[PDB]
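Here we describe the complex-level prediction in full. Unlike the single-chain runs in Section 2.1, the four entities below were treated as one system.
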Amino acid sequence: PRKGSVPKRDVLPDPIHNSKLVTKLINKIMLDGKRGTAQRILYSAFDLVEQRSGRDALEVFEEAINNIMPVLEVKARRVGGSNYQVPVEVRPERRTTLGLRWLVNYARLRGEKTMEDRLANEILDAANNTGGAVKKREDTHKMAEANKAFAHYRW
Amino acid sequence: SMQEKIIQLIQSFNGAVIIVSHDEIFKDEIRDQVWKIENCKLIHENVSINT
Amino acid sequence: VEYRGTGRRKNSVARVRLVPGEGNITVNNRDVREYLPFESLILDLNQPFDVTETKGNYDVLVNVHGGGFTGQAQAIRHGIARALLEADPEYRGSLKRAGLLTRDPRMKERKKPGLKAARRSPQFSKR
Amino acid sequence: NIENGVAHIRSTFNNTIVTITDEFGNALSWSSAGALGFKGSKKSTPFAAQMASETASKSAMEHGLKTVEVTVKGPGPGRESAIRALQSAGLEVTAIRDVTPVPHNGCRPPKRRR
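The structure predicted for the assembly as a whole is:
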């Protein structure tokens, strides 16, 4: 807004895994205002995945949100007959908003049945640099490359 | 002369198609989804693990 | 030898009664893990107990009224902490730095006329 | 083979061009923004003049020239980025010049655009 800036809202850790990267992933999972049926989907997919792969539940999830952290990205201006897409560098707290919704809306776009395991097959494929969520820090990373020419039009 | 009359046909079909082909200049402008058989399993083009 | 305190949150009123004992919390004839349905609320309504570092020293003994499960699991935590500046009031430097002696005034808002809600306008078409 | 050429940067408002010669104007190798396949409004900019000025040198790098003394020409948005592309790719500039054509009032110039 014009007048200035504001804070955000600072959420207290999970009961169990003891991070705030799993409270801010329920707020991406929650919908319509129902934190009941979002905490089935998020503790039934740390142990629907913890079987499949024999290391911890939180180091195969937290490497599943660090292949997805887009480091560059495009923003726009106009010219007067063209409208060029500039590439800007991404802050250290916006890469954590996008990795966590590039992982949860690339899960309703999947052909499994119950979203215990869509979210479960997407934290284990995305841990190996592959599939849906983690081409999209690659969709979004040529566009900051193709446009490497228009960088001087920056702010 | 007939390789063009059926390249327009495959493009003017408004359904879904699975194409198996070895010529490069036909499967170059129609590349939407590209699976592949490497060892014994099919892969996709959403695997940005290569480069 | 029990301490006293009322805390409110959002149209729930809960009267809490700190005693000398071991970790256990009973609310309205029930064990609160039958009372509270998420493990999210039973972690922070003993937020007071990890800021002062008296993790297990008290049995809790709550009496609740009003609201629903969040506002009752949260009017409580303002009892546990407004019955512990009453035991050692010199605890009060640090239970107030975690921001735990605020009543939290954020209530539910009037509905306004010619709006469909507090802040939700009707759909605008100009032609 | 060859040592000590000169680089002839030539930037306009569309399209820069860099040509490296020996010291007898002998055209070792050339290259330029539109050769790399840059289309207009990219063709013009400072990125492309630093591609183009290093697809040149590295392909006459390979004749063992390593010292160049640049001469610059034109107005150009992308003039000067083409001399950190150069001196980047291992060539050791000697000293530069802005040799642009200046009439001592000669022929008459086109109209100006409305």
